């Protein structure tokens, strides 16, 4: 699209409509973009000394990108609630994007006095990496997505990436991608950039919780017909004499019943409690946390494989890195106290996946014989096994929406671990930069790189609309399901509202599983 | 096909052409075939005493088979190089085979003097087991495939197989397949045997190395928004008092960052070093090597599941059985010294799969509390887990090309472990035998089995052409990729050449990953 | 072309005719071919010490080649004379080649006594490097072309070539061409191999 200077390049679309089966969440926000790295690509690396587990090598670019991989960039409390309360599941189908009403300003810091003014002509160029030839950054839970609250103006993030490294230094194989080596489209004012995408058949996120659970799944009333090993030894006057007898598992017997499927896999996490007291006093934050390691650098295992966060009656506990944790609007960056964060809870799964903090089961160790007692041992890490079945990490309104499946020789069940939809070809990276403006050059020629540009930034609005599909409920469940509600009682502030000084804020994390489906 | 005696049953096709997307490697070689087991099927078994882990039972047949399950039976250094240097990947599509110019000779060892001459009439019969009713031997890394070097004449291997066994003895279930119970086609001279095959949709072998790596994958510039557990206890005058505080992972924080996918699986191997010194002195060749075991016989775990062979700066090490090892042209059969072999290296993977010699990660053990320190333990064997992603063993010019997927109730990701393409219905076994020639029988009848045949063998050439598909490169990588080159400096002998006495020889193993794709 | 065992795969053409403007010199000769380097490619180099101006590095092949880059393989004194006496100049235009009546023998040196006999089946394979992907040796004034005199039987030369070298040793850039990496056509007896060529506009040799 194209037009004039006194012509709005696009209108403001920010609705949300439900169609019974679909529902489209349109949404627009105003943004701003500075000139990063003063227009140059800069090489960047870990700090020489820095622990090995923390080295790196890569580049930062003068390019800034766009991102809305956060559910709340599309759903509004209320809306989300609608969804989350009457749908067995849902998934994204297609999207449409558009930047417009772009405007380029140029600040002038003459002595003790700045003065911003329109640089009409100068441009901002955009380009979408629709061929995925660029290090996909999104999906890395970074923060600089869209504001949950419309009215909020925002700054565009700067693109940076990482290649290979042998400590703080580069290794040859590492590649250096240059963003100008693409065909950016250049916008001036009166210019807009639209583009549209279509998702790929993915599974509806399961937005329901299970009423039955693996173990308790058969019918009480009837005993099976298969037998199991009831007792081993037997009374012989005073002493026992080994004599194995078997029984037919019934209701009273349950624990012993024969089955057909196994809980999901696991990778044991340390348990910490919301109650300061209980927790051993010391620094096992890193030392005790569950991790894995590549090329000799141990990394953390955050968002561990999807597994319930606490047994019955222990909402007080949680994994050291088995859950998602968001900050309460305002919460500072580092070492903030428990009271400043919102920890997610995944009890809803208990029913199928193991509890993060407790071992999977316990396999037998030795082979018993008359002169040898029967061994056994608990298992803290069980990789996928036939017959296992499980549930993936719920979603949360202010959580990630999707993530790119890495291009590898092999993947195994790609639901992104941080939760979300695992996409092979996700929404392409959208980039934006401000074509430089060489400030006054010298009369006599010089072949040096230009270094003195006009100080200036851009701004303008952006809009994103997405169509989601739904799987409606359908249970013959007689008694009421659970629903997500807002507290009745009076409060000094409404949840998901602007305070007295107009600061919007999300009180709690809102999950997705409320409706109840049987297993 | 058919014709006369003074008529070449086929010409010599040994080209190789590239078409931009495909590339066909035609190739012909001269061969020779003796008469095995003096024409009879012989029962064969382990040696009574022999360690249990080494028993067996099966048969050897008078039949010899054909095989080219080695990349170099089709690619020529140069060619291979072309491929390997400009292609994100490739795979086989179809093939065509033909035997021809068959000729049957008959030696005469009269006293101190042999004398070979043409037995025109007598025949050689061939037959392809296109229904896979015969124990698929190929794929077992046996040696008797085609000569890498054209000019080389070769001997055809003899077919043998193995069934069940209870120690050195047979067990009933074990089957005994007889090769005459097939409809062999019989060739006399002037007769040729052609046949063609078509591969099945398989995945292009990934012939590229990764520039990013799981851990270092997100964007440096921006800190995430999810929080993790920064510290546990806290300064209380003199003493610490447990007080968990959380932080928002940033660049400096990296190791702690939240992610979305896990390294490939693992099965720990012992580390040995190319440097004699380091290595503990003793015999842990078997005792210390990683293995598994069926029906009480521990077998070795060679070509362990695909996993990088050494961390940064340790090209000197390697798994005890985690790598492929070829002999330097000439190297004898047993206990040959390190200097006689070429060990493959899979550093290229590091980026996704764990290091063979070092544990996967470390899960937590106990549940901590005030009166209990936080436990933890390293994991040396991790079975596939959701979110895991990885790369398969590279290929190597002189490596296997494919392998038959065993007919079972269940497989999991069939890329053959020794590397190659996992095929459900691979190129059918091709067999060949020389119809016997009863040497002079007695005038008076006898119903005994004939035992005195004419001494004779066969020869003639064989040709195999195969069409491979390619996936061309396509990265916006600015700086140069790595390529495979031959050393500039002078040398007494060219690599992949015949020495002074015309002995072709492959200097080093050549992999496949050189081109660099992002993760 | 193809046929049987008791069938001459080609006749003997050895004429020479003048047409006023053209003149065609046909010519046939009998030849023989051993098995070189006992069937293998052998690496070859100057003799370590040997003056520098005389070092080299290259290979010898089990392959033998054909050559008639000598005017007398086509002209007969007399003929040549005709030409040479009444023509301001001349040049070649096209050619046609054919091998035939191929026969493979096999000697038997049993003790103090050899005995040659027909190995009917076995073959001889031929192939023309029509894409010039092989080190062009001919033109190097080598000797093993055709006999000037028809009646003369001859032996076929063996193919060998030279690459780069840093003294008596090889240098990487040097290439090693393998003759089997071509699609040889295989002849058995009763088999013939013909092929034809066409020269390119060149200047008449000034014969005045």
Curated annotation (Swiss-Prot), chains A, B:
Biotechnological exploitation: AAV capsids serve as viral gene transfer vectors that have been shown to affect long-term gene expression and disease correction with low toxicity in animal models, and are well tolerated in human clinical trials.
GO terms assigned for molecular function: structural molecule activity
Domain of life: Viruses
Assigned keywords, A-Z: Capsid protein, Clathrin-mediated endocytosis of virus by host, Host nucleus, Host-virus interaction, T=1 icosahedral capsid protein, Viral attachment to host cell, Viral penetration into host cytoplasm, Viral penetration via permeabilization of host membrane, Virion, Virus endocytosis by host, Virus entry into host cell
Compartments, as annotated in UniProt: Virion; Host nucleus, Host nucleolus
Cellular component terms per the entry's GO annotation: host cell nucleolus; T=1 icosahedral viral capsid
GO BP of this protein: clathrin-dependent endocytosis of virus by host cell; symbiont entry into host cell via permeabilization of host membrane; virion attachment to host cell
Miscellaneous remark of the record: The ratio at which VP1, VP2 and VP3 proteins are synthesized in vivo is about 1:1:10, which is the same as in the mature virus particle.
Family per record: Belongs to the parvoviridae capsid protein family.
Recorded domain comment: The N-terminus of VP1 is sequestered within the mature capsid. It contains a phospholipase A2-like region and putative nuclear localization signals.
Function: Capsid protein self-assembles to form an icosahedral capsid with a T=1 symmetry, about 22 nm in diameter, and consisting of 60 copies of three size variants of the capsid protein VP1, VP2 and VP3 which differ in their N-terminus. The capsid encapsulates the genomic ssDNA. Binds to host cell heparan sulfate and uses host ITGA5-ITGB1 as coreceptor on the cell surface to provide virion attachment to target cell. This attachment induces virion internalization predominantly through clathrin-dependent endocytosis.
Name of the protein in question: Capsid protein VP1
Protein's organism: Adeno-associated virus 2 (isolate Srivastava/1982) (AAV-2)
Organism phylogeny: Viruses, Monodnaviria, Shotokuvirae, Cossaviricota, Quintoviricetes
Boundaries of the shown chain within the full protein: 217 to 735 of 735
From Swiss-Prot, chain C:
Compartments (UniProt record): Virion; Host nucleus, Host nucleolus
Family as reported in the entry's similarity comment: Belongs to the parvoviridae capsid protein family.
Name of this protein: Capsid protein VP1
Applications reported: AAV capsids serve as viral gene transfer vectors that have been shown to affect long-term gene expression and disease correction with low toxicity in animal models, and are well tolerated in human clinical trials.
The protein's role, per its UniProt record: Capsid protein self-assembles to form an icosahedral capsid with a T=1 symmetry, about 22 nm in diameter, and consisting of 60 copies of three size variants of the capsid protein VP1, VP2 and VP3 which differ in their N-terminus. The capsid encapsulates the genomic ssDNA. Binds to host cell heparan sulfate and uses host ITGA5-ITGB1 as coreceptor on the cell surface to provide virion attachment to target cell. This attachment induces virion internalization predominantly through clathrin-dependent endocytosis.
Extra facts: The ratio at which VP1, VP2 and VP3 proteins are synthesized in vivo is about 1:1:10, which is the same as in the mature virus particle.
First-to-last residue of the parent protein present: 217 to 424 of 735
Top-level lineage group: Viruses
Domain commentary: The N-terminus of VP1 is sequestered within the mature capsid. It contains a phospholipase A2-like region and putative nuclear localization signals.
């Amino acid at each position: 699209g194209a037009d004039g200077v006194g012509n709005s390049s696009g209108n403001w679309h920010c609705d949300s409509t439900w169609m019974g089966d679909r529902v489209i969440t349109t949404s627009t926000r105003t943004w701003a973009l500075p000139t990063y790295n003063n227009h140059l690509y800069k090489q960047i690396s870990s700090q020489s000394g820095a622990s090995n587990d923390n080295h790196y090598f890569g580049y930062s670019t003068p390019w800034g990108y766009f991102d809305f991989n956060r559910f709340h960039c599309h759903f509004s409390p209320r809306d989300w609630q609608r969804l989350i309360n009457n749908n067995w599941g849902f998934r994204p189908k297609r999207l449409n994007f558009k930047l417009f009403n772009i405007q380029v300003k140029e600040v002038t810091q003459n002595d003790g006095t700045t003065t911003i003014a329109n640089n009409l002509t100068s441009t901002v160029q955009v380009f979408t990496d629709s061929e995925y030839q660029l290090p996909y950054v999104l999906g890395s839970a970074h923060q600089g997505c869209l504001p949950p609250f419309p009215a909020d103006v925002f700054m565009v993030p700067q693109y940076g990436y990482l290649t290979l490294n042998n400590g703080s230094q580069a290794v040859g194989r590492s590649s250096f991608y240059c963003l100008e080596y693409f065909p950016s489209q250049m916008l001036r004012t009166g210019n807009n950039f639209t583009f549209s995408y279509t998702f790929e058949d993915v599974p509806f996120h399961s937005s329901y919780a299970h009423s039955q659970s693996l173990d308790r799944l058969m019918n009480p009333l009837i005993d099976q017909y298969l037998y199991y090993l009831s007792r081993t030894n037997t009374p012989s006057g005073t002493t026992t004499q080994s004599r194995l007898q078997f029984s037919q598992a019934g209701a009273s017997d349950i624990r012993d019943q024969s089955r057909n499927w196994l809980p999901g896999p696991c990778y044991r996490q340390q348990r910490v409690s919301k109650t300061s007291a209980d927790n051993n006093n010391s620094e096992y934050s890193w030392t005790g946390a569950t991790k894995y390691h590549l090329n000799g650098r141990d990394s953390l295992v955050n968002p561990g494989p999807a597994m319930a966060s606490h047994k019955d009656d222990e909402e007080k506990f949680f994994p050291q890195s088995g859950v998602l944790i968001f900050g309460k609007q305002g919460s500072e960056k580092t070492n903030v106290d428990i009271e400043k964060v919102m920890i997610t809870d995944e009890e809803e799964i208990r029913t199928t996946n193991p509890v993060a903090t407790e071992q999977y089961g316990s396999v037998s160790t030795n082979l018993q014989r008359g002169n040898r007692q029967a061994a056994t041992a608990d298992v803290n890490t069980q990789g996928v096994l036939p017959g296992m079945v499980w549930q993936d990490r719920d979603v949360y309104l202010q959580g990630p929406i999707w993530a790119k499946i890495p291009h590898t020789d092999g993947h195994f069940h790609p639901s992104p671990l941080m939760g979300g939809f695992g996409l092979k070809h996700p929404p392409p990276q959208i980039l934006i930069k401000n074509t430089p403006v060489p400030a006054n050059p010298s009369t006599t020629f010089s072949a040096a790189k230009f270094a003195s540009f006009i100080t200036q930034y851009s701004t303008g609005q952006v809009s994103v609309e997405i169509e989601w599909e739904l799987q409606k409920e359908n249970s013959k469940r007689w008694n009421p399901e659970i629903q997500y509600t807002s507290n009745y009682n009076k409060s000094v502030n409404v949840d998901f509202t602007v305070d007295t000084n107009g600061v919007y804020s999300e009180p709690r994390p809102i999950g997705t599983r409320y409706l109840t489906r049987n297993l």
